[PDB]
Design a protein around this ligand. Structure first.
Ligand SMILES: CCCCCCCCOc1ccc(C(=O)/C=C(\O)C(=O)O)cc1
Ligand SMILES: CCCCCCCCOc1ccc(C(=O)/C=C(\O)C(=O)O)cc1
Lengths: 207, 208
């Protein structure tokens, strides 16, 4: 019954250091874990999967987009990409446009995202409307702010997973997690595998 | 030493506690009120600056505790949407706030008809009002600004959120305010949650 899973993918640095290796090695094992979690969600009928890594990261996704598209995956980047270079912004817009019509798993990749930023960008929009005389203070309600925060078109976030041992949201989704199950595991992101993902889905199923 | 200035607690488990012992709901609420007094005293004696309680006619007959709070030098505040509350419910709240506002010990915030989303929304409305008066430009609105308009912005940031009763969600409780907070869930039911359980959450925040 779990429709939308968000993951705070923490522990790449600590994993690398445990393996006696440099940071980049953790990243490469992190990316393999990303692919495994994406495959697992698409195989198990999850509607939306939202991943928060806790420009270089987005660039690496770029070469995977053709393969996501074949898999009927809809890709979106959420977060403030407005100071990214224009070449990268255009590559992001093209990948989103390429997959926007896909009807399988929606994969949201947070890039320079903050939950408070997300709320503020939606408040800014309402503020522009009030100034234009197009809305009244008294008309702003939860429903309306909801319509201006990221992911408002998707199933509500049902489950948030944080790997890596910390017990904090760290300014990932805030508005969107009002009623979500929160599942924290000490497993580090590169080790987080199908069995760990299923274990989290069980916690939800028990709720 | 523990390092929390501000602890918030989702106090769940009262109903389950009373059921476990074949008692009706009201006996749980009552054990739960005893557990509130205990948590309040414990916070006041362990140098916490602020304790924010979300209970998950509660507020009413609770007037009857305001004199006792005042005698413990606790500053009382109600957060939440009380604007559609009964005549004078609103007045007795205001006088309770006024009476204790000079207190210098623990600040105790009691959520009454509170939701985290509503909290953000009221702050957004204060901001929209100022835009409409021509006082505020949309592009001056940043996080620091909205932060100044949500409940409790003048108190230390929330360091730690405790939720008793075994569920692992926020259930709409502080959403903006808990962006950086430690989250601590215990299966202990609210009426059983005692000083050593509170110590255990604080020491967990200190170690983590
Ligand atoms: C740190 C960057 C991580 C980038 C990983 C992006 C997620 C890609 O996940 C995938 C998941 C599945 C597949 C996959 O199924 C590809 C195919 O089925 C195919 O090419 O025919 C390919 C990629
Ligand atoms: C009805 C909802 C919960 C009721 C408690 C509201 C807050 C009261 O906090 C208190 C904290 C400490 C004390 C206190 O010292 C009480 C006593 O010595 C006593 O009741 O005999 C009393 C109240």
């Amino acid at each position: 019954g779990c429709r939308h899973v968000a993951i705070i993918m923490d522990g790449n640095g600590r994993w690398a250091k445990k393996q006696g290796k440099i940071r980049a090695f953790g990243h490469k094992a992190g990316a393999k874990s990303v692919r495994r979690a994406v495959s697992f969600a698409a195989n198990n009928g999850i509607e939306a999967l939202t991943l928060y890594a806790f420009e270089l990261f987005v660039w690496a996704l770029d070469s995977e987009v053709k393969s996501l598209h074949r898999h009927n995956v809809r890709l979106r980047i959420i977060g403030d990409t407005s100071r990214f270079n224009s070449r990268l912004q255009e590559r992001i817009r093209k990948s989103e446009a390429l997959t926007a019509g896909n009807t399988g798993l929606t994969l949201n990749i947070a890039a320079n995202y903050g939950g408070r930023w997300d709320i503020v960008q939606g408040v800014r929009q309402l503020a522009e409307k009030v100034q234009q005389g197009n809305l009244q203070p008294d008309q702003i309600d939860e429903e309306m702010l909801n319509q201006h925060v990221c992911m408002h078109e998707l199933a509500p976030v049902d489950l948030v997973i944080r790997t890596g041992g910390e017990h904090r949201i760290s300014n990932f989704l805030l508005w969107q997690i009002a009623y979500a199950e929160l599942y924290f595991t000490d497993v580090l992101w590169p080790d987080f595998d199908e069995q760990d993902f299923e274990g989290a889905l069980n916690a939800f199923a028990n709720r």
